[PDB]
Ligand SMILES: [Cu+2]
Ligand SMILES: [Cu+2]
Ligand code: NA
Ligand code: NA
């Protein structure tokens with residue numbers, strides 16, 4: 001399989017390690033790991049365009065969107081490539097992440113390697129919020145932690 | 154063109170921002186930026202195989218070496234793809250990095266996106282140190298700071 005990894009860090013207590021695996025060319029990508037330091041409940045979770053952390057997570061730019069689509073949820077046909085929905089933190093502030101996605105890839109034009117994974121302050125409304133930002137950012141708010149997605153062994 | 158960036162961090166603080174630019178896929182990569190917190194003199198400087206910072210810079214693995222060649226300096230034919238030689242810190246501990254390299258790339262199979270840039274404790278002996286480690290690591294010693302190479306705007 002092709003593999004990737006990301007260490008999430010930010011200005012506050014949110015930190016984690018997320019793994020990626022793609023067993024087959026153009027096959028599903030498994031995304032799994034843990035993030036701690038979160039408020040209980042849903043937090044938006046996306047791949048952003050740039051693997052630039054020079055001024056922290058803001059430097060990563062907008063969601064990764066090579067097809068020029070509107071923001072959506074991962075189950076939607078209308079979504080950005082980087083739209084991975086929400087992760088859910090428990091009462092202790094820990095999110096056990098376990099996602100399978102076939103829109104992201106670890107090779108080719110939808111490759112996420114060298115881009116930034118971000119976990120947000122608020123839940124992502126998946127493009128269903130009824131204001132104009134919903135179909136751009138999902139109203140997920142501030143960026144709590146992020147890291148560049150790297151090739152793994 | 155075509156751009157990448159890397160934020161180097163380690164204890165000291167040893168820290169820096171390194172930029173990469175490649176005008177065309179058949180052209181060289183310019184590598185430039187600044188690193189502070191270093192001891193005066195030469196420090197080894199390489200791209201390592203994995204963009205994995207899970208346990209700090211050790212997790213990046215060996216030098217990026219897809220052709221399975223011996224370690225060398227950047228001018229040599231027999232070198233690892235990731236072998237960028239040394240950077241030089243002044244009396245204030247600052248290295249102004251300015252490299253052009255024709256063996257690394259920002260696309261294709263020598264692509265360094267998603268890999269780790271590392272600056273070392275010791276100078277790299279460029280494979281001419283006369284012990285067996287010389288033609289593996291250049292005897293550059295510990296890893297002072299590193300970061301994953303990300304796609305830049
Ligand atoms: Cu996001
Ligand atoms: Cu090195
Ligand atoms: Na969802
Ligand atoms: Na040299």
Ligand SMILES: [Zn+2]
Nearest residue numbers: 063071080083
């Ligand atoms: Zn989006």
Ligand SMILES: [Zn+2]
Nearest residue numbers: 216224233236
């Ligand atoms: Zn080497």
